[PDB]
Amino acid sequence: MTEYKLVVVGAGGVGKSALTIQLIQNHFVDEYDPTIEDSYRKQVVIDGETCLLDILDTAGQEEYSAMRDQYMRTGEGFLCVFAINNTKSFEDIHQYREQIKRVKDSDDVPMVLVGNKCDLAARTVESRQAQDLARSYGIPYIETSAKTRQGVEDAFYTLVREIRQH
Numbered sequence: 001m002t003e004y005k006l007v008v009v010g011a012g013g014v015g016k017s018a019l020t021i022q023l024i025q026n027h028f029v030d031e032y033d034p035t036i037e038d039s040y041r042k043q044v045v046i047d048g049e050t051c052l053l054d055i056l057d058t059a060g061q062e063e064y065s066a067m068r069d070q071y072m073r074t075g076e077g078f079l080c081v082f083a084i085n086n087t088k089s090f091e092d093i094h095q096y097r098e099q100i101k102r103v104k105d106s107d108d109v110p111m112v113l114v115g116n117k118c119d120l121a122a123r124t125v126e127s128r129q130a131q132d133l134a135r136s137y138g139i140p141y142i143e144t145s146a147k148t149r150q151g152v153e154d155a156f157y158t159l160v161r162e163i164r165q166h
């Protein structure tokens with residue numbers, strides 16, 4: 001069956017782990033344990049196709065930036081996550097995209113831009129700003145909440161559907 005290698009990237013604390021765990025395990029992780037690098041796999045049906053999701057949950061703490069080249073080489077599609085209440089995290093997206101672009105020697109890498117924590121009211125990144133950023137990369141923008149499950153399946157499934165367009 002078809003296997004899709006997804007890699008979840010973004011700054012510390014934006015909710016990469018919570019998003020992934022909500023998707024695979026269907027619960028919300030409230031506590032904050034910084035990730036080094038974890039792998040998750042789950043067989044799922046997407047648009048009638050039975051497939052395997054191979055998801056790499058990566059480190060947002062910059063001390064581990066050295067590991068980025070390895071996973072960027074392996075991954076087929078990248079979920080670029082920021083938090084809507086964390087401007088700096090949104091600004092950090094460009095540094096992730098650039099490295100992906102270098103490593104893949106491509107600017108048609110399957111990606112989805114994700115604005116997570118859309119359940120919180122402390123918004124400093126407005127939807128339209130993120131929409132504009134994603135437009136410049138030629139990718140979708142999707143808002144999520146790992147807490148309420150809003151948009152979680154759509155984000156990852158859209159990433160799959162982007163890999164398929166390539």
Ligand SMILES: Nc1nc2c(ncn2[C@@H]2O[C@H](COP(=O)(O)OP(=O)(O)NP(=O)(O)O)[C@@H](O)[C@H]2O)c(=O)[nH]1
Pocket residue numbers: 010011012013014015016017018019029030031032033034035036058059060061116117118119120144145146147148
């Ligand atoms: N309200 C709310 N809190 C969230 C959401 N996603 C994550 N959080 C909270 O934000 C904190 C950090 O989440 P986490 O998933 O660990 O972030 P991370 O990006 O995986 N961190 P790291 O890069 O260090 O591995 C946790 O306390 C988590 O509960 C969300 O959608 N809504």
Ligand SMILES: [Ca+2]
Pocket residue numbers: 027028029030
């Ligand atoms: Ca919990």
Ligand SMILES: [Ca+2]
Pocket residue numbers: 107108109137138139
């Ligand atoms: Ca692109």
Ligand SMILES: [Mg+2]
Pocket residue numbers: 016017018033034035057058060
């Ligand atoms: Mg994490």
Ligand SMILES: [Mg+2]
Pocket residue numbers: 124
């Ligand atoms: Mg503003």
